């Protein structure tokens, strides 16, 4: 299957028609998505197969074919771009200055953009197009609207 670097939709045919369950990032031959999209299940690309290599439900991250590759971080200052890939719709950059998830363990980037759950996995970029983490794990706030973490994994 296609190994080309860039962003991908995660589709299933288990439901009616073809349904976009999520999104992922191909880099250095490894496919990076969020655990809640695939559930750690294997994926197809053409007639090729991607087998899970790493994953962790709490971080809500999963890599395929190899270890996590994405080590770039929000600088705590600069605006970011969500390369949003919504269901049925073309890739859309949507530029925002991230908020902040304050946790007992530490502060995390947070982007406040609302989109269908099928957009889970779309990357968030810095000014050099480096992926600083994945969109699609956070919280519904006072307003009824959605705020997602900038979820980044650790490289080795």
């Amino acid at each position: 299957g296609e190994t080309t670097d860039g962003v991908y939709r995660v589709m299933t045919r288990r439901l009616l028609g073809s349904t976009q369950v999520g999104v992922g990032v191909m880099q250095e031959g490894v496919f990076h998505t969020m655990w809640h999209v695939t559930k750690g299940a294997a994926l197809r690309s053409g007639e090729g197969r991607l087998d899970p290599y790493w994953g962790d439900v709490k971080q809500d991250l999963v890599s395929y074919c190899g270890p996590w590759k994405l080590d770039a971080a929000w600088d705590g200052l600069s605006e970011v771009q969500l390369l949003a890939v919504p269901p049925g719709e073309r890739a859309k950059n949507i530029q925002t200055l991230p908020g902040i998830f304050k946790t007992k363990d530490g502060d995390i980037g947070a982007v406040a953009l609302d989109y269908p759950a099928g957009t889970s996995g779309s990357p968030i970029l810095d000014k050099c197009g480096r992926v600083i983490g994945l969109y699609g794990n956070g919280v519904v706030i006072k307003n009824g609207s959605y705020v997602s973490a900038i979820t980044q994994g650790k490289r080795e």
Partner: protein
Amino acid sequence: DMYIERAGDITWEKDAEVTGNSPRLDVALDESGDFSLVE
């Protein structure tokens, strides 16, 4: 059973549709990986 399709290059695109605010939220992360507003 689940499959991928390419949806673009990952590139910074100058003059994109800027939007969204920058809230500071107090959150807790549970063992299931589910965030929650700590109040």
